[PDB]
Design a protein around this ligand. Structure first.
Ligand SMILES: NCc1cc(Cl)cc(Oc2c(Cl)ccc3c2nnn3Cc2[nH]nc3ncccc23)c1Cl
Lengths: 554, 400
């Protein structure tokens, strides 16, 4: 196997650091023999060279098993090697692949061993095959090539592959080359002949540079199995997903289930994972059996149904626009599809996130549009045209009245229920002929006890005692009280910016049962006007609820 | 001959991830970089450079914008202490200030061989087909604060005839731009800019018009009403109780006296003339600058922006919260992101003119919406630092 004639990549150690000096542990005779055999073969091939006694560095060697393998413990050298640039920013996604007339897979033979190592850095790769019972001096070698397990190998190989491919890519702009690890994926729209000719020209260019690749009878045939994907000539899919039928599910079983479903989510539309994920909440043992809930059984059933039949994705056509469609699956769950030609999907996906403790479908939909937008730029270098289950008017009302700079690129309403709506709207001005509730909450921070209440301009009053509470929980409880004893139209005055904030953002869902109860009330209401005052300023009705809730508390 | 650049001790070069870029923006950068390489300004690099700085393309011709925010922070001692450019107090007083892009000057001066690695950037690829195209600078890079710092001496000799001939023209160099101010009539001012463009033209280097003297306060506005409701007074006392934390001599005692008993919000309540006395007196304090607030050169500047609806935005610049050095407003086919980037740029240029430093922004937006979109509208050669905030609902109405 050749060692590429390319210019070496200069390697440095970390500033203030010298090479490893880790003592070789004595080995068994069988391990020493195995290593001697291995090392003399590599020495012949040019891979390693014998060194003198002057070299003071050392990295330990070991051998494991009918054939023997040599394992170098590069942990110490790796701790002293300079940092390298990140090999890759991401992984190619199948949906980003164009449909090519012919595609061939070329894997590089003994990749790392085919590329030289900086002459001035070779000294730090020094290792010793010990003598029987460490009696006499050992056999000393250093690497001439990129060693397996060393920190710079992935990076230096990739960089070497880049400089090599450079002149070929310049003279063949209509040829696709995917660089992945020690593989090269070559695609073109040439006729089955001039492509076969171009592959040999590539193979030959690579050989002139120490890199060996398979010939026609050894190169793989489609479908290509790569990274959990199946790449057929006119479609792609995920590899066979088989969901286990278990009597008892363990933490580990559900974890593997969730992972498999998540992976299936990229092409199979409608995959749900919330109810299964909920079972994984908390601290439970790998082998601990989790009984499924009704909701988890229902979600598993729907998922088995989705996966019953096989689904495929199509490839990318650069001359067509991408269309992204989103649907509300349920509570906090969003599902999307991306296509160019109606309903022939390139890919699919899901969004189920909790951005805060209080949110709404409008905020969730914009969060999903941003997630999809980013993804599209990564996969295709362009954003899609959205088809959203929200009316232009609902969106317009939200962005106009919300405090946050909220935006959505080119979109269109699509009537695919459940539709995204605002469940209630707060008043802009106080209501004439509605009772004004002044609300307050106060909790003692030693006892944890608090009081929640209100006073009205109609002389009405109420004070409820609460047990293991906070000032925030009491303030929210006070609002709930005022909503409960109110009637269709209310003006509410609070000194809580915290409560003001939650309610003002029009939440339709919360991780707080109290906030969900407030939502239930706000919906039933015809008109609500929420106003704010500074606390402890002796303000009108505010000083009155203050004295009432403070009594025996603060 | 290169000026040796040393990084701040203990910390090393920037290792900042590259953002996804659209097909159009990548092609624009590849074309730009191929050319800069041919011209020897940038060199293709090895994997042995662990450093990275993000790169973007802005706009009628595409231009490369390198985000040196992390490199700048890491070289602060160099461009600020060691090689600082003094900021003129006169610039903010000038009737006109023209901004000129002078960043093309930087590529005539080489970068210290031992600092070049710290300028690494990557042109990304679509669907990760290709490893990014990696490069580093051989010349002073545009967007790095160390560039005007080093070029300072060369800029001094280019401007010397112009300055000797025009002693009342203020010239300030901030990053890639030159800020040229005069108290002349607009025609004579525009004539003097053309004259300076000719001086710059003999050395290689090749307008945007501000009027700093016509920049005024955005006072905390106190309403002027016939009928005052319980709610209107409550809203007024809230606004004044908060202004009293900034401004010395604010009084609410008389307006507060009115808010007695648990009254209905819609109830019209007559005013007491002593309450009108306070109103008048507070309105007067609110129009004038804040007493006791001074710019501290060693402390960072903060800018806060609030969406007011109807395409209007309010902002405040301070160093210590609510101790406001400046307040203002930005008013607008536009969207919130486009509007927000426009306000960020206007506030930054005013901040450069007034203090010689960009503020760190508290943006009322989603990190992701901002990240994906900001480049679609960005026009400036610099990028300020920014945080993402959840605007308190009251800060919005007290600044309305
Ligand atoms: N190791 C996997 C692998 C991963 C990656 Cl990320 C890229 C790969 O190579 C392709 C190239 Cl170079 C171009 C189009 C492709 C490819 N793969 N699929 N399609 C679409 C396509 N066009 N024509 C095809 N003919 C046969 C199979 C798929 C085809 C390969 Cl084989």
């Amino acid at each position: 196997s050749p060692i590429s004639p390319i210019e070496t990549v200069p390697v440095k150690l970390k500033p203030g650091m010298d090479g490893p000096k880790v003592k070789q542990w004595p080995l068994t005779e069988e391990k020493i023999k195995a290593l001697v055999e291995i090392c003399t073969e590599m020495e012949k091939e040019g891979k390693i060279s014998k060194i003198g006694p002057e070299n003071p560095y050392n990295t330990p060697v070991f051998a494991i098993k009918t054939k023997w393998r040599k394992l170098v413990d590069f942990r110490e050298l790796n701790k002293r090697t300079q940092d390298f640039w990140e090999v890759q920013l991401g992984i190619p996604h199948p949906a980003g692949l164009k449909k090519k007339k012919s595609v061939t897979v070329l894997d590089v033979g003994d990749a790392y061993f085919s590329v030289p190592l900086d002459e001035d850095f070779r000294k730090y790769t020094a290792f010793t095959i010990p003598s029987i019972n460490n009696e006499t001096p050992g056999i000393r070698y250093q690497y001439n090539v990129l060693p397996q397990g060393w920190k710079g190998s992935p990076a230096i190989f990739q960089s070497s592959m880049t400089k090599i491919l450079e002149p070929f890519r310049k003279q063949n702009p209509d040829i696709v080359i995917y660089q992945y690890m020690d593989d090269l994926y070559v695609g073109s729209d040439l006729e089955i002949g001039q492509h076969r000719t171009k592959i040999e020209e590539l193979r030959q260019h690579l050989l002139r540079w120490g890199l060996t690749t398979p010939d026609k009878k050894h190169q793989k045939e489609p479908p290509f199995l790569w990274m959990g994907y199946e790449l057929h000539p006119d479609k792609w899919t995920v590899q066979p997903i088989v969901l286990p039928e278990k009597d008892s599910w363990t933490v580990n079983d559900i974890q593997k289930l969730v992972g498999k479903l998540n992976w299936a989510s990229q092409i199979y539309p409608g995959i749900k994972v919330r109810q299964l994920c909920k079972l994984l909440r908390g601290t439970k043992a790998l082998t601990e059996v989790i009984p499924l809930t009704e909701e988890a059984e229902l979600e598993l059933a729907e998922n088995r149904e989705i996966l019953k039949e096989p689904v495929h994705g199509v490839y990318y056509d650069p001359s067509k626009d991408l269309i992204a469609e989103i649907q509300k699956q349920g509570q906090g769950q969003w599902t999307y599809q991306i296509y160019q030609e109606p309903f022939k999907n390139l890919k699919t996906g899901k969004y189920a996130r909790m951005r805060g403790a209080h949110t709404n479908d409008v905020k969730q939909l914009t969060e999903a549009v941003q997630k999809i937008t980013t993804e599209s730029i990564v996969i295709w270098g362009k954003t899609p045209k959205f088809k959203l289950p929200i009316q232009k008017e609902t969106w317009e009302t939200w962005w106009t009245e919300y405090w946050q700079a909220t935006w959505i690129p080119e979109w269109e309403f699509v009537n695919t229920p459940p539709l995204v709506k605002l469940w209630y709207q707060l008043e802009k001005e106080p209501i004439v002929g509605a009772e004004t509730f002044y609300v307050d909450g106060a909790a003692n921070r030693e006892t944890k006890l608090g009081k929640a209440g209100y006073v009205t301009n109609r002389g009405r009053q109420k004070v409820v005692t609460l047990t293991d509470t906070t000032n925030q929980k009491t303030e929210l409880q006070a609002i709930y009280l005022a909503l409960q004893d109110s009637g269709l139209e209310v003006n509410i005055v609070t000194d809580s910016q915290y409560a003001l904030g939650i309610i003002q953002a029009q939440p339709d869902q919360s991780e707080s049962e109290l906030v969900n109860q407030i939502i239930e009330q706000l919906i039933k209401k015809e008109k609500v006007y929420l106003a704010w005052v500074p606390a402890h300023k002796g303000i009108g009705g505010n000083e009155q609820v203050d004295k009432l809730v403070s009594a025996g508390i603060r």
